[PDB]
Design a protein around this ligand. Structure first.
Ligand SMILES: N[C@H](CC(=O)O)Cc1ccccc1F
Ligand SMILES: N[C@H](CC(=O)O)Cc1ccccc1F
Lengths: 237, 300
C-alpha cells in the first residue's frame, strides 16, 4: 500500500524500486498580456525518477513543444509522466525493471496504473513521506540541462555522486533529502552553505561538492540549522 | 392470467411477488398467487419469519411452464418446481381457486411500475447470468457472489454478470490510455455494446436485473453491477441519444420504487454524485436527477 515512516528501510532493500516525482513536469511563468489579461508561458520541465538504493536518476526532460496545442495541461502532465515512466520501464531489461514504483503525489496513481496495466506484477504505490524532490531544479547541473534542452531528452545522473563508496544508501538518501529540503526552504542560503568554501569543488562528473566525511557532518549540521532557522522565521519562534 | 400455486405454507414467511409483499402465518391455509400478468418476467421471493437471514427467490416467466412452490423441510426453504402434467396442474389450481385459497396479484390498472422495471429483462438472459440449466426458472439469494467478486467461491452458485472494470486492458486501448480512462465511450460502445451485449436492450436488461436483485435480495454484488453499468454510460462522452433518454426513464422508476429506508445501503453516494453532477451526462438525466434531488437530497 502506501509508504510511510513505519516501512522506511524497505527503500534500501534489494527489491528494485523507483520514486517518481512529477512536480516539475509542467512548469509555467504567469504574466500579463498587452490587453491586461493573464497568460502562461510554459518552460522546460522534467520527470524525476530515482532509484533510492543506487542513486540512479533517469531525468526525462519535458520540452515545451509537448504542450503545443494541448488543453488541460496540468491533467495532461500526469498522463505524459505516466507514459514516459512506462516507456522507461519497457526500455529496461527485465532484470532491471522495478518491482515497485512509488509516486510522490497521489494524483499520479491512476495515470501510472493505467499505463502499466501490461505490468501487473509492478506495484504502484503512494507515500505518506513529504519528499522534497520538487527542489531537484535547485541543483545547478540538473536545472542547466533541462533549460538548455531543445528537444525531448533523457539525461542520466547519479544523485549520490560517489557517496555510496563511503556510506550506506539509507544514509545517502537521508543526506539527499536533507539537502533538497534545505534548497526547498531557502535556496539562496543552502547554495551559500554548499559553495561558501572555494577549496571544495564539484567534480565535473558530480552534482555536489567533494566534501570529506568530516566536512559532510559540518554541512549537514548547517543545513539542519538552516531548516530550523527558516522554520522560526516562518512561524516566529 | 397465470398462477403460482403452493402445496402448503408450513413455516411463517413474508412472500414477495414482484414489488408486492404479504405475510403468511405458520400452517396458514395459503395455496399461492393467482392473476399474475402474462407478458413479463416475475420474481417470487421469501424471507422466513424466524430467520430473516437469506432472502431468496425465483425468477420465472409463466409462459415457459407451469411452476409451483413446495416447502422442503430437509433443505428448509420454499422451492420452485415445474409440473410436467398440464391436466393435473390446471385441476389443482382450479380447486385452489374455487376454495379461494390464493392471493391475487394486486396490480392497479393505472400502474406500469413492473413493466417499467423489467422492460428489457428477458428470462433467456437471466438464465445465462444464473446458471442452472435443468430448470426454466432461476434462483437468487442475498449471499450469491458474482464472477467478478470471486476473481477478487463456488462457481456453480454465482451471478455471471458481465465484468466491468475501468482499469483493465479490456477498457483501455494501448496508446489511448488517458483518452479511454477519462472518456469511457470506447469501452461502452465498442467493447460492451457492439462486442459483448450486441445492443443496448441486452445492456439495459442486465442493468435492470442487477438492480432488482439488489433491491429484493440485498445482493451486494448486484448493487455493484448496477452502479458499474450506470457509471459506464455516464462516464462516456459519446452515447446514443436514445440510450440516454431510455436510461433516464429506467433509473427514474428504479429510484421511485426503492424503499426509502433502504436508500443508505442500495445507493452509492460517489457514483450518483459523479453521474448527476460531474460526468459527461450530468445534464442528460433530467427525470432521474429530479427524483433523486427530491427524494434523497441527503445522498447529494
Ligand atoms: N553509470 C550510469 C551513469 C551513466 O553512465 O550515465 C549509472 C546510471 C544509470 C542509469 C541512470 C542514472 C545513472 F547514474
Ligand atoms: N405437487 C403436485 C404434484 C407433485 O407433488 O409432484 C404439483 C402441483 C402442486 C400444486 C399445484 C399444482 C401442481 F401441479
Amino acid at each position: 500500500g502506501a509508504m510511510n515512516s513505519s516501512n522506511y528501510a524497505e527503500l534500501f532493500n534489494n527489491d528494485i524500486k523507483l520514486f517518481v516525482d512529477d512536480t516539475n513536469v509542467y512548469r509555467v511563468t504567469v504574466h500579463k498580456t498587452f490587453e491586461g489579461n493573464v497568460a502562461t508561458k510554459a518552460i522546460n520541465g522534467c520527470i524525476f525518477t530515482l532509484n533510492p538504493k543506487t542513486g540512479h536518476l533517469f531525468l526525462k526532460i519535458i520540452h515545451t513543444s509537448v504542450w503545443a496545442g494541448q488543453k488541460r495541461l496540468s491533467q495532461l502532465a500526469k498522463w505524459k509522466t505516466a507514459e514516459e515512466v512506462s516507456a522507461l520501464v519497457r526500455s529496461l531489461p527485465k532484470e532491471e525493471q522495478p518491482k515497485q514504483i512509488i509516486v510522490t503525489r497521489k494524483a499520479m496513481l491512476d495515470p501510472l496504473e493505467v499505463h502499466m496495466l501490461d505490468f501487473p506484477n509492478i506495484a504502484i504505490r503512494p507515500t505518506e513521506l513529504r519528499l522534497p524532490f520538487s527542489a531537484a531544479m535547485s541543483i545547478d547541473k540538473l536545472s542547466d540541462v533541462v533549460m538548455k534542452a531543445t528537444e525531448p531528452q533523457m539525461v542520466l545522473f547519479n544523485i549520490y555522486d560517489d557517496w555510496l563508496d563511503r556510506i550506506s544508501s539509507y544514509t545517502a538518501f537521508s543526506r539527499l533529502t536533507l539537502l533538497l529540503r534545505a534548497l526547498k526552504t531557502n535556496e539562496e542560503s543552502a547554495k551559500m552553505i554548499l559553495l561558501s568554501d572555494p577549496t571544495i569543488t564539484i567534480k565535473s562528473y558530480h552534482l555536489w561538492p567533494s566534501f570529506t566525511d568530516e566536512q559532510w557532518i559540518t554541512i549537514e549540521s548547517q543545513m539542519r540549522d538552516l531548516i530550523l532557522t527558516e522554520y522560526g522565521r516562518k512561524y516566529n519562534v | 392470467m397465470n398462477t403460482v400455486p403452493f402445496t402448503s405454507a408450513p413455516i411463517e414467511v413474508t412472500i414477495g411477488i414482484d414489488q408486492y409483499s404479504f405475510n403468511v402465518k405458520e400452517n396458514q391455509p395459503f395455496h399461492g398467487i393467482k392473476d399474475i400478468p402474462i407478458g413479463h418476467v416475475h420474481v417470487i421471493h421469501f424471507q422466513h419469519a424466524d430467520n430473516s437471514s437469506m432472502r431468496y427467490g425465483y425468477w420465472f416467466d409463466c409462459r415457459m411452464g407451469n411452476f409451483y412452490i413446495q416447502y422442503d423441510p430437509k433443505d428448509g426453504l420454499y422451492k420452485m418446481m415445474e409440473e410436467r402434467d398440464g391436466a393435473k396442474f390446471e385441476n389443482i389450481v382450479h380447486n385452489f381457486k374455487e376454495r379461494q385459497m390464493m392471493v391475487s396479484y394486486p396490480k392497479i390498472d393505472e400502474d406500469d411500475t413492473w413493466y417499467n422495471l423489467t422492460e428489457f429483462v428477458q428470462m433467456d438472459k437471466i438464465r445465462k447470468i444464473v446458471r442452472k440449466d435443468e430448470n426454466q426458472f432461476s434462483y437468487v439469494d442475498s449471499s450469491m457472489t458474482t464472477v467478478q467478486e470471486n476473481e477478487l467461491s463456488d462457481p456453480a452458485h454465482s451471478l455471471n454478470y458481465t465484468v466491468i472494470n475501468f482499469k483493465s486492458r479490456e477498457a483501455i486501448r494501448p496508446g489511448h490510455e488517458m483518452e479511454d480512462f477519462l472518456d469511457k465511450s470506447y469501452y461502452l460502445n465498442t467493447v460492451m455494446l457492439q462486442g459483448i451485449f450486441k445492443n443496448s436492450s441486452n445492456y439495459f436488461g442486465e442493468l435492470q436485473f442487477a438492480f432488482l436483485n439488489a433491491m429484493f435480495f440485498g445482493n451486494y454484488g448486484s448493487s455493484l453491477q448496477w452502479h458499474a453499468m450506470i457509471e459506464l454510460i455516464c462516464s462516456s462522452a459519446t452515447v446514443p441519444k436514445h440510450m440516454l433518454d431510455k436510461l433516464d426513464e429506467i433509473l427514474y422508476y428504479q429510484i421511485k420504487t426503492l424503499p426509502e429506508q433502504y436508500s443508505d445501503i442500495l445507493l452509492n453516494e460517489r457514483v450518483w454524485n459523479i453521474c448527476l453532477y460531474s460526468s459527461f451526462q450530468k445534464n442528460s438525466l433530467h427525470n432521474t436527477e429530479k427524483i433523486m434531488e427530491n427524494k434523497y437530497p441527503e445522498l447529494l
